Amino acid sequence: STIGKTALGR
Amino acid sequence: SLKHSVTQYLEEIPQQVQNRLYTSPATCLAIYRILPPLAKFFIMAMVFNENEVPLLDLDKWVNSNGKLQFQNAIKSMKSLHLLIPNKSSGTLMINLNPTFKISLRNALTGGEVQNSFGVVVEENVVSLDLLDEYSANKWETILHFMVGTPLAKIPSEKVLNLLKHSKLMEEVNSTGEFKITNEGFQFLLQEINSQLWTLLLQYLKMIETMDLVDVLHFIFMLGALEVGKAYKILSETQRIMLQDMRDYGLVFQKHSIFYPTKLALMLTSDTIPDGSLIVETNFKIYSYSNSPLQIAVLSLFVHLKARFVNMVLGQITRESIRRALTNGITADQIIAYLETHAHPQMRRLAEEKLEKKLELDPNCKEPLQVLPPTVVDQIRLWQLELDRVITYEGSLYSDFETSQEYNLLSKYAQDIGVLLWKDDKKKKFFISKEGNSQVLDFAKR
Amino acid sequence: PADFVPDSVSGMFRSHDFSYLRLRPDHASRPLWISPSDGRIILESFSPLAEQAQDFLVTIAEPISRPSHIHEYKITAYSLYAAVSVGLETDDIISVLDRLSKVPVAESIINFIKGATISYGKVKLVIKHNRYFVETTQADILQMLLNDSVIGVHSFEIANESVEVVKKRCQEIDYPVLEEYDFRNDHRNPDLDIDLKPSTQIRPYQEKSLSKMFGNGRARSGIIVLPCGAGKTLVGITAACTIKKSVIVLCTSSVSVMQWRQQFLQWCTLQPENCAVFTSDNKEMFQTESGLVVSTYSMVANTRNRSHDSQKVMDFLTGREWGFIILDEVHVVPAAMFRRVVSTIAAHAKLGLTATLVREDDKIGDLNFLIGPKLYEANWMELSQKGHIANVQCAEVWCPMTAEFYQEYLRETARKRMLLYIMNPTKFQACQFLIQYHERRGDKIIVFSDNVYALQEYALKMGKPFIYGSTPQ
Amino acid sequence: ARARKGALVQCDPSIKALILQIDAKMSDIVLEELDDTHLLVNPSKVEFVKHELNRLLSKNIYNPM
């Protein structure tokens, strides 16, 4: 479950 | 945490009071049971011999493997001042407390005990019909009022005063209401034994000017008493204390004789399920519980939709989770409640899922999650939604004559942990309101 | 609810507390809880008698939600109207409901079942030489139907266009109509001898769906709901091959229409000579006595402008009295104009095949008087765990809108805001990463997009083929 | 050497833009822009911007009845 990880992007 | 909590309280008490606390064997027989197994082994050895035993002799008993346990046992035994270290003739001799020693000897060998365990009126009452009903209802009232569910008969001011004065159930006159807190849900998450010790421990700290030892002479003695029998009536402080204890569902009184209850014996030592619930991927809840306590606590973070005699069915929603979070209930506690109150069907299916995962690849051992991960993720995400906007109270510092001064003041704020943001280019920084005065004072000097 | 003390927590349940009734001694075995007010049914799928009820419940109650463990059904008028057709009377429903319920069935629920379960079985609509006769088996009905304000052994004619009125009228009045076909005794319509070749393997749920249709021996008109990819095509083929009469198929696409003919040829012994595909490309019709037509709604529901080539074919369809109609994707038949085909085309049996039976408007219920009740439904997870359909790990990626794009989203209106949040670069990156990751895994990917401008932009950026409405077949 | 009482708002681009829009409609909200993740806001408006922003975000969330 990937909640706390930083958001995706460039 | 049970023995840890009771032991921890007994350590902080000054030594001068511990010596007086061991005069009554009833208390000694209770404090003896809480120590680690090795501590009890050594204590029993020293009780019957009137001599002094060197510490090295105690060390010889323990095997090499169990050497670590010998450190905790001696530390815990010395903290309560039960074991007095006397050094003479070049040897660190070890002896047992004379008052503790005599009390234990009296308890085991049936010596004069000064009614430490009480007396018997030999007028028994029915345990199942009355004692179970009385304290279950009395304990039900305090928990119902704790959960916030409406209830007809509110408890007396004594426990109400205790509830508010504790971290449990924060209240505000401006709000005009009482609501549960982070520790509140934790308290409701604890077994009956610890649920009772929290209130009794808080009562111990609340009282002022009633001796501290007397309030312990009653609680520990109350454990010695056996349910379903009479005990005639003791210290003066133990009278009002007895009536005060009557409001927590510990002792039942017809109106000269008091009767301990199931919870009274539940204090000394330890000892489909009701409360088990099913959570689906549709965010539904089906609780196999018939008890207003469980229903009320479920209502903290569940939108109840209907009930039957055997079960209760509701739905998890954003409104309910937000309502619980606003009260200080952490999502980690919520999932703990769901996991520890999970239906056997969820456990069996989760085990099968793990078995299939290990069947294909036994290299990795995935954690056994009883309930679906989507619900946990959604609950945590809603917690993040509450944490989206971040705001601090403080001041912004600007218009610095010199970079040195800006770095000096900002670095000082960082050192004392009151700096929240800074920018070297603009020579600006923001510090919390808590550290404002310290930064101002440092600036002047 | 007499002399029943409320509980201190009863306030949280607003008139929904059902503790006024007591639990039966055999609660541990019985799997059903029944809501005396809302009609909801809670089913334990992990207890004995779970399977015996999972099919009985599907007949009398439409399913609301069927998660892993605890299923939730609900009894409504239409669900009962679906169960009343296949040889079911009030007594059987009440008996089983009581026998499966942990709690006694309340009087309110009994009242609801009694009201709607007695209507079935006294009016029959028959067709003869493209003429529709509302034939009734008793004389008393004349004083009801002929005296009805809307209408207009005894049998009387009725306008073909007016079928959609009387059938709905029959619902309001006591007796609703049933469309049953005794294809065994029908000799006037030329037969077509087609059968399933031995290589076929009729799966269990397909047999169950057909049994709910041919249970009595006369084909019932209705709807069959099976998950996507469950094999609804073979269900329709089997129905055509067992009725053994001229059949017409309506499908809402040109690619899909081509799919049906290839499937019909492959699974049964339908000779190619008797199959005619009426699409925008080719319009020739079979001249053999009995044959098959696979067409589309757009080519059959049109009213104003039909070409000369497409006018002869439509007359060919209308002139003959067909024996079976297969409405693929029947969730679109109750639309404003598509429903007209159900009236114009003459047929004694109507079947509906759709994985999803839902629409935004309230026209879904109109299917009852257009083609009949819902015969059978199938679970999705049940077929998934049995290997009949694939398992899918559904996911929802959160691509946070970049700062630059987001600012415009605030000011722009609703209609353009859509194009704005469909083309944010982060979505391009996520799609590109997933495509590369799954392609390395040897997977065949499909990228859907209702917006065509984004579809073309994505395709030309990634050098991949794309399809949209302007594409020749 | 100059102190200025206020509230330091830490947030992400999306929340930052919404606060700016609220500040444009009501001028007093934002006292100063610090960085792409920090804003200085008026103390009296902290309890209002926090409450108003949730109302705006409620449109993006589908609450079933």
Ligand SMILES: Nc1ncnc2c1ncn2[C@@H]1O[C@H](COP(=O)(O)OP(=O)(O)O)[C@@H](O)[C@H]1O
């Ligand atoms: N009994 C069966 N034997 C073999 N293949 C089958 C069977 N039933 C269905 N299929 C296959 O399932 C797939 C989907 O069939 P289709 O009729 O298009 O499903 P639906 O119309 O329900 O979406 C096709 O590849 C078809 O050949």
Ligand code: BEF
């Ligand atoms: F994809 Be199928 F026609 F449900």
